[PDB]
């Protein structure tokens, strides 16, 4: 309540909503903490840090805006609730429960409110298409991110990417993290989902400089300390935005993680810069403060400014698969990469099989067609049927692995990388056989 | 018609390559039958009898494989096809080592280097393979070193004019001619889903069904040579006969190019045409009688099926005998020697 009053002191029109909003926040937080516990999923940890992140998100969304209606404040409240609570959830029923109870809490604590404006099914926020972090519709976001993916094909990696709904949602989540104060992300999910790809794509898209640790045979803690020195020197002194991406190839060493937690929490690593290193850090911090326009002279104030710059400049992106301390879970904003849904598989198939012919004008649509994509157009075309069959093949591998596990045999995981491999193989084989027959003809 | 059929054929073949490979022979066949049933249910045209080995390979490559140490089995031919048309670096799970020797023989001209994960000099060799562009076969993958994750995932960063890959603490210049074959000799091994995503599995393990099929094929080859020849003709009719027919067509066109006076010097050139026609008729006959020969070979195979099941059961009892006592170590080659003794040099059969 004190924090919300301080936050809403910016907008005199919403001061009377400081007390109710806080209550709503508290209630929802409590509800989630009762509903989701660490016994189900190890990352279902809730603490006052999530509430501080909620307040910080609402503060960052409200700071540049001159005025808001009450519906806008409730909408950003719901948006931050979704980004902090629903994102970590693994199963679908939990996400549905969270989405309904956000509405329930908002109506309970904010009566006489137009819920249509304060709650549309695709609650969406981004300042990519404007100057301020305003709500934005789904279609223009999809168009803008498709254009940026087309750009990202030339610069950096050349392998194609498909922008389906889950990918775009995760892109928006990672962008929100990259625009938060000390916003650190933990992409937890299945292998091959696209965690590294999307993290790097959003980091490039927002201009962040991707830095990754290169551990080796007997990696020394002194080497990790030097890497941290370089990263914080660039983030704080040089005013450079850095996406500090870490993967399980080096996250598995918890000795570095427990030292990373200090930077994740406070935004500084005391004892990292000492002696000569501390003197050079103070010199460069003085130079940077003068360049920005601050004549801070005392070493303590310079260190405070450096810590603030690291808070506002350095973002750490952890990438892991479903050991890790709950403190690390609670320091980072949790995002879940599930296995690609049927719609995602269908979209990937249609995009990656678009250069193929896959068009029979005399295709007779079968009665009672076996359909795996519920939203598949009826009546389907030949290409639609082919992509449906591809999705069915992936689903049959999943069912086969489930049956083998039930019988007691050893099974391997079918990641979305298997589906991408299958579609690439289909393209190569189709083109090869067509070329062979055409030259024969 | 083959234009009409290629879409379904390639869908099934690509699914087989990408998805099958860890499963046993019956499980691959069940997956293929499920996919074929779905494609038929959706009126997606495909050939009813997809011979995967002959669709995804030609006689020249199969003969070259047989020149190498690739056993002439359906499972091994399918596994070699996966080892050929792979987009992800394969993980070989042979318990015997024939597949590793096959890989070494295939890439001997490319200077393939055999390394192990247990070797302390592994990483260094890997760096060389990444930098100088040489095939590398890394064994003992059950102790997989996660440092290979960027290499298997092909995560490259194109800084400057040099393409890099992060191996350990060092950024190695990836070479276009690099290929790595992971391998293991442990059939009962579990891999993390990360590695499962970065590699394609190629299982050479001999199971009950694989050995049953091997024994059935050997019975058919030994005691019913005519039925074995007819079955081989079915497999060859999936393109090999047409391949040689079109090769003779090309030869006839080449001979018909040189036509100036010598076309009617004897006016008996028609012989070559007759030859093609004859073979055409032959293959046409083999096309017309395909269903009858399929029924015949299936009945003959059902005749010797119980013997094949008996052979599989006998071998697996022999293999399991090691639990009774440590001396009871009997290899598959030992059972095959027993079985060839029973088949060929059996004085009772005289």
């Amino acid at each position: 309540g004190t924090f919300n009053r301080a936050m809403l002191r910016l907008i005199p029109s919403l001061r009377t909503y400081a007390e109710p909003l806080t209550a709503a926040m508290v209630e929802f937080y409590t509800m989630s903490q009762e509903r989701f516990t660490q016994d189900t999923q190890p990352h279902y940890i809730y603490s006052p840090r999530e509430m501080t992140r909620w307040v910080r998100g609402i503060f960052e969304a409200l700071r540049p805006l001159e005025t808001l209606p009450v519906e806008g404040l409730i909408r950003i409240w719901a948006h931050e609730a979704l980004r902090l609570f629903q994102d970590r959830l693994v199963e679908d029923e939990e996400r549905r429960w969270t989405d309904e109870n956000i509405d329930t809490v908002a109506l309970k604590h904010f009566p006489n409110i137009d819920r249509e404006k304060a709650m549309s099914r695709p609650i969406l926020y981004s300042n990519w298409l404007s100057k301020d972090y305003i709500p934005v519709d789904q279609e223009e976001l999809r168009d803008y991110v498709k254009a940026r993916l087309k750009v990202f094909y030339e610069e950096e990696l050349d392998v194609p990417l498909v922008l389906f709904n889950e990918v775009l949602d995760h892109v928006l989540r990672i962008d929100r993290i990259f625009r938060q104060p000390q916003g650190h992300l933990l992409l937890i999910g299945v292998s091959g989902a696209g965690k590294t790809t999307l993290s790097r794509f959003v980091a490039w898209m927002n201009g962040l400089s991707v830095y990754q640790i290169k551990v080796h045979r007997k990696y020394t803690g002194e080497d990790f300390d030097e890497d941290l020195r370089t990263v914080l020197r660039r983030s704080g002194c040089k005013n450079e935005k850095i996406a500090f991406i870490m993967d399980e190839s080096n996250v598995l060493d918890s000795g570095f993680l427990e030292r990373m937690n200090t930077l994740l929490a406070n935004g500084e690593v005391p004892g990292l810069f000492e002696g000569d290193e501390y003197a050079t850090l103070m010199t460069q911090c003085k130079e940077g403060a003068q360049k920005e326009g601050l004549m801070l002279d005392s070493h303590e104030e310079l260190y405070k400014w450096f810590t603030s710059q690291v808070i506002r400049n350095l973002h750490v992106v952890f990438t892991m698969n479903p050991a890790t301390s709950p403190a690390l879970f609670n320091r980072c904003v949790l995002n879940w990469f599930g296995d690609w849904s049927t719609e995602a598989l269908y979209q990937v198939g249609k995009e990656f099989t678009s250069k193929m012919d896959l068009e029979k004008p005399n295709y007779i649509v079968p009665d009672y067609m076996p359909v795996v994509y519920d939203k598949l157009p009826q009546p389907p075309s030949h290409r639609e049927a082919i992509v449906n069959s591809c999705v069915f093949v992936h689903q049959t591998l999943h069912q086969a692995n489930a049956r083998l596990a039930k019988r007691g045999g050893r099974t391997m995981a079918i990641t979305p990388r298997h589906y991408l491999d299958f579609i690439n193989h289909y393209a190569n084989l189709f083109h090869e056989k067509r070329s062979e027959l055409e030259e024969q003809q | 018609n083959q234009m009409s059929t290629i879409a379904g054929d390639c869908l099934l073949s690509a699914a087989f390559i990408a998805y099958a490979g860890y499963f046993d022979q019956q499980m691959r066949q069940n997956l293929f039958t499920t996919w074929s049933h779905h494609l038929q249910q959706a009126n997606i045209q495909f050939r009813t009898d997809i011979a995967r080995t002959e669709y995804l390979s030609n006689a020249d490559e199969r003969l070259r494989w047989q020149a190498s140490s690739l056993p002439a089995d359906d499972l091994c031919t399918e596994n070699a096809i996966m080892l050929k048309r792979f987009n992800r670096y394969p993980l070989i799970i042979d318990p015997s080592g024939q597949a590793t020797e096959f890989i070494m023989n295939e890439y001997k001209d490319r200077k393939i280097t055999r390394t192990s994960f247990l070797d302390d000099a592994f990483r260094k060799n890997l760096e060389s393979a990444l930098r100088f562009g040489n095939p590398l076969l890394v064994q003992d993958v059950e102790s997989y070193d996660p440092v290979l994750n960027p290499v298997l995932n092909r995560e490259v960063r194109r800084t400057g004019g040099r393409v890099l890959i992060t191996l350990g603490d060092q950024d190695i210049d990836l070479s276009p001619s690099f290929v790595i074959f992971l391998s293991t000799r442990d059939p009962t091994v579990e891999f993390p889903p990360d590695l499962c995503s970065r590699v394609t599995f190629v299982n050479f393990t001999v199971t009950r069904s694989s050995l049953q099929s091997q024994c059935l094929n050997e019975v058919l080859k030994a005691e019913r040579p005519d039925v074995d020849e007819k079955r081989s003709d079915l497999l060859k009719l999936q393109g090999e006969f047409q391949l040689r027919l079109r090769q003779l067509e090309k030869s006839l066109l080449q001979a018909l190019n040189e036509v100036k006076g010598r076309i009617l010097d004897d006016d008996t050139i028609i012989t070559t045409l007759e030859n093609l026609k004859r073979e055409a008729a032959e293959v046409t006959r083999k096309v017309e009688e395909t269903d009858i020969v399929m029924q015949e070979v299936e009945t003959v195979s059902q005749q010797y099926l119980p013997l094949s099941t008996a052979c599989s059961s006998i071998y697996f009892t022999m293999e399991s005998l090691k639990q009774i006592h440590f001396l009871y170590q009997y290899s598959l080659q030992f059972f095959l020697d027993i079985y060839h003794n029973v088949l060929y040099e059996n004085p009772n059969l005289k």
């Binding site: 019988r407 007691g408 | 009950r208 059961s313 697996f316 009892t317 293999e319 399991s320 639990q323």
Partner: peptide, 29 residues
């Protein structure tokens, strides 16, 4: 098991259920 792999699960389930039935649940100190 290793001699013939395919029945074993149901038999083991029944055997373990019977064993749980015979073996007393708790022993008092």
């Amino acid at each position: 098991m290793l001699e013939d792999e395919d029945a074993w699960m149901r038999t083991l389930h029944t055997t373990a259920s019977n064993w749980l039935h015979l073996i007393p649940q708790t022993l008092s100190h």
